[PDB]
Design an enzyme around this catalytic site. Structure first.
Site, PDB file in Angstrom:
ATOM      1  N   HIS A 216       0.835  -1.199   0.000  1.00  0.00           N
ATOM      2  CA  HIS A 216       0.000   0.000   0.000  1.00  0.00           C
ATOM      3  C   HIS A 216       0.864   1.241   0.000  1.00  0.00           C
ATOM      4  CE1 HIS A 216      -3.776   2.230   1.313  1.00  0.00           C
ATOM      5  NE2 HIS A 216      -2.863   3.052   1.777  1.00  0.00           N
ATOM      6  N   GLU A 217       1.855   1.273   0.871  1.00  0.00           N
ATOM      7  CA  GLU A 217       2.724   2.443   0.919  1.00  0.00           C
ATOM      8  C   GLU A 217       3.580   2.572  -0.323  1.00  0.00           C
ATOM      9  OE1 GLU A 217       2.140   4.802   2.947  1.00  0.00           O
ATOM     10  OE2 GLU A 217       0.640   3.556   3.885  1.00  0.00           O
TER      11      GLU A 217
END
Length: 416
Positions: A216-217
């Site tokens: 996600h990051e």
């Protein structure tokens, strides 16, 4: 084929090249590890990137966790390095993760530092300063840094240094991204949607696979490296969850995009088209700026090499004379790759894990974990170890069946 060629130990001796003391753009030098071209890991709590966030004590919001001592010892730093490395390998072992990581490594922040149009120059805040064997510093360009969290241990986020007038994450240029992340903790969520999205229910039966969290990051980092992040002032004033509405919770379009799936559909077609055009325009500005540059600043790379770097990053067209232009078909294809193909929801499908179904939920708990031992977690299976009880039904993620892998540190339910 591995993404990280060395299995660094924290106590491995410095060499000034891929194990070095560094400074980021007063601070004391910190020991850092170059795990891949353009990518470094700093196993320290981030007391550096933001002057207002220089210590590790509480100011607490429900979803937060404080321990000023976390990531202070060499053993913890050794395990942090190993855990982050394993998660990169887990990501890279999927076709989608390999695609994302390739895009990230190719996404060199633009050399937009010159105020003289005819010269092309690096921006210094897209570099680190590395102590060489002689004790002096050299400047190294990089794309990505993984660093430990600041005071709130579970506030993971992808951030970067600004420029005085340029909006580097939103003008196509991109900037070196610092991801505050820990592999040592994970969130609990609920398997029933109506429970997961209710702030009063559920203790967090299932644990999020940290590979998803890191992915996600990384997806945010991709957007930001290509200078296509949506301005955080563009938000969905959520009106699809009564509890969100009671508290006025707004979620950024950028988060919804990154999650993907149905969440991304809260950005309507007109807004999608608006952003696509806006970023197309930014890529055109970059082509124009490259065409005006007739000399490079500095001695390390040739003008023709750096023009090629940016041709490959932005997938620019180049005519025989050397003039760049943006092809709208290739732009749309790359923009779609970065924004629709690289999503949390797609990663879930490649990792074959259970995960939250939406960003519009309420986190239930935080757990302490340890993914370093292969008996706990693997590159290939995460927690859901093959040929064991944990292989089926996401039993490895089930904190009540695989209880030895999770210790609950805090319940969030009830605190909202």
């Amino acid at each position: 084929m591995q993404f990280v060629n060395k299995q660094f130990n924290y106590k491995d001796p410095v060499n000034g090249v891929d194990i070095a003391y560094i400074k980021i753009p007063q601070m004391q030098p910190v020991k850092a590890f170059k795990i891949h071209n353009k990518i470094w890991v700093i196993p320290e709590r981030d007391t550096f990137t933001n002057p207002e966030e220089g210590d590790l004590n509480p100011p607490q919001v429900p979803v937060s966790y404080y321990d000023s001592t976390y990531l202070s010892t060499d053993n913890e730093k050794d395990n942090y390095l190993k855990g982050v490395t394993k998660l990169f390998e887990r990501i890279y072992s999927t076709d989608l993760g390999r695609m994302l990581l390739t895009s990230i490594v190719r996404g060199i922040p633009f050399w937009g530092g010159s105020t003289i149009d005819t010269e092309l120059k690096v921006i210094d805040t897209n570099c680190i300063n590395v102590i060489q064997p002689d004790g002096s510093y050299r400047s190294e360009e990089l794309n990505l840094v993984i660093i430990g969290p600041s005071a709130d241990i579970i506030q993971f986020e992808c951030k970067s240094f600004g420029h005085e007038v340029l909006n580097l994450t939103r003008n196509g240029y991109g900037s070196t991204q610092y991801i505050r992340f820990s592999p040592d903790f994970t969130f609990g969520f609920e398997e029933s949607l109506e429970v997961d999205t209710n702030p009063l229910l559920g203790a967090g039966k299932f644990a999020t696979d940290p590979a998803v969290t890191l992915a996600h990051e990384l997806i945010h980092a991709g957007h930001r490296l290509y200078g296509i992040a949506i301005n955080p002032n563009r938000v969905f004033k959520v009106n699809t969850n009564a509890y969100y509405e009671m508290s006025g919770l707004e979620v950024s379009f950028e988060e919804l995009r990154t999650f993907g799936g149905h969440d991304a559909k809260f950005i309507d077609s007109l807004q999608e088209n608006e952003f696509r055009l806006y970023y197309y325009n930014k890529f055109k500005d970059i082509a124009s700026t490259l065409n005006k540059a007739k000399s490079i600043v500095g001695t390390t790379a040739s003008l023709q090499y750096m023009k090629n770097v940016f041709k490959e990053k932005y997938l620019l067209s180049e005519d025989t004379s050397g003039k760049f232009s943006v092809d709208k078909l290739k732009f749309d294809k790359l923009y779609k790759m970065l924004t629709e193909i690289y999503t949390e929801d797609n990663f879930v499908k490649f990792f074959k894990v259970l995960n939250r179904k939406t960003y519009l939920n309420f986190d239930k708990a935080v757990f302490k974990i340890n993914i370093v031992p292969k008996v706990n977690y693997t590159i290939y299976d995460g927690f859901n170890l093959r040929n064991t009880n944990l292989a089926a039904n996401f039993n490895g993620q089930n904190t009540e069946i695989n209880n030895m892998n999770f210790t609950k540190l805090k319940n969030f339910t009830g605190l909202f």
